[PDB]
Amino acid sequence: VVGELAALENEQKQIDTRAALVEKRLRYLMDTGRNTEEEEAMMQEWAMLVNKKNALIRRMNQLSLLEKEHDLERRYELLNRELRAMLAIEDWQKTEAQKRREQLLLDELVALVNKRDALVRDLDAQEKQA
Amino acid sequence: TYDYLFKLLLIGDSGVGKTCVLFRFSEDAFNSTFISTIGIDFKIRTIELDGKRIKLQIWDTAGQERFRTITTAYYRGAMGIMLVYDITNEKSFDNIRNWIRNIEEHASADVEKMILGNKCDVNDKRQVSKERGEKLALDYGIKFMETSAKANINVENAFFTLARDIKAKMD
Numbered sequence A: 001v002v003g004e005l006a007a008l009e010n011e012q013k014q015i016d017t018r019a020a021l022v023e024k025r026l027r028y029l030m031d032t033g034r035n036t037e038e039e040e041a042m043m044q045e046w047a048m049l050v051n052k053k054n055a056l057i058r059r060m061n062q063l064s065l066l067e068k069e070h071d072l073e074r075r076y077e078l079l080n081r082e083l084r085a086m087l088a089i090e091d092w093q094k095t096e097a098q099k100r101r102e103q104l105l106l107d108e109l110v111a112l113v114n115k116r117d118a119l120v121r122d123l124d125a126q127e128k129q130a
Numbered sequence B: 001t002y003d004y005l006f007k008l009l010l011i012g013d014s015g016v017g018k019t020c021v022l023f024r025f026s027e028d029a030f031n032s033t034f035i036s037t038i039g040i041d042f043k044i045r046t047i048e049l050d051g052k053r054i055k056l057q058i059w060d061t062a063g064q065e066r067f068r069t070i071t072t073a074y075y076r077g078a079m080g081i082m083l084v085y086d087i088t089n090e091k092s093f094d095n096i097r098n099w100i101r102n103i104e105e106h107a108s109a110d111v112e113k114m115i116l117g118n119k120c121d122v123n124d125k126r127q128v129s130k131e132r133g134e135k136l137a138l139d140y141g142i143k144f145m146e147t148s149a150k151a152n153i154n155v156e157n158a159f160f161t162l163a164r165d166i167k168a169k170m171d
């Protein structure tokens, strides 16, 4: 659904430029007090266009967090298979730079689990506000 | 899309069955292959317990000695801990009291612990009887279950009891 998320970013650009073309009109029709007929019609569109923007943002939030979760999991799954192959080689066979290379691979692996944990922590603070 | 998030932790010696117990709970399968955990991992499974949606974040520690300073950083903020031994391995049951002292030196004060005697399908290699796992956890004031990740004995029961003991404590 990668082609959906790029389409929703331009759908959001269609929404808030229509919403910017509505809010200056609805301010001018209220401050001058011009037409009460097109003031009822502009308020039900602007309430629709704000609630359509809010439903499009929170679906774009849950698609962006799922895309980051999929990318961090496949980077974790790759780096774990590289580390399993490195740690199966004995200590005396590799060089001293290659032993400190696999320590950095281990630190990067703990960093990826903490990044995946941060997506869990961020989704926990998002749902209690929603 | 859920109600509450509970942080769980699995600790114990290498080879007792920590990853296999989590793989049974989160994906309903069993691996025969010893694939040792490197550092630290977690798995998510969202359950339906008592009409309520509970996501479980269950951290899986590497039991080897070379990863033990990484796994000590994950004790704080665990809401529930499984201490796993192997019922076919006398020394891993003996090491549970070292893991008890590793919990109480690093974890939170109110964390709910539970001892799992894993590999309870392997009767002909049993070195630790079921009565001795029952008396040790009753001594610690702690629930006990004999599990088998291979035979799917009491795995889902262990996690759903540990989340029931968390959710009753919120009430």
Ligand SMILES: Nc1nc2c(ncn2[C@@H]2O[C@H](COP(=O)(O)OP(=O)(O)NP(=O)(O)O)[C@@H](O)[C@H]2O)c(=O)[nH]1
Pocket: B012, B013, B014, B015, B016, B017, B018, B019, B020, B021, B031, B032, B033, B034, B035, B036, B037, B038, B061, B062, B063, B064, B118, B119, B120, B121, B122, B147, B148, B149, B150, B151
């Ligand atoms: N018969 C039997 N074998 C089991 C059971 N659980 C795990 N095993 C076997 O025991 C071995 C170790 O399992 P594993 O889950 O890797 O243990 P671990 O505690 O996660 N190891 P580590 O701390 O190094 O990551 C594997 O070969 C697995 O197939 C069980 O319930 N029954």
Ligand SMILES: [Mg+2]
Pocket: B018, B019, B020, B035, B036, B037, B060, B061, B062, B063
């Ligand atoms: Mg493991």
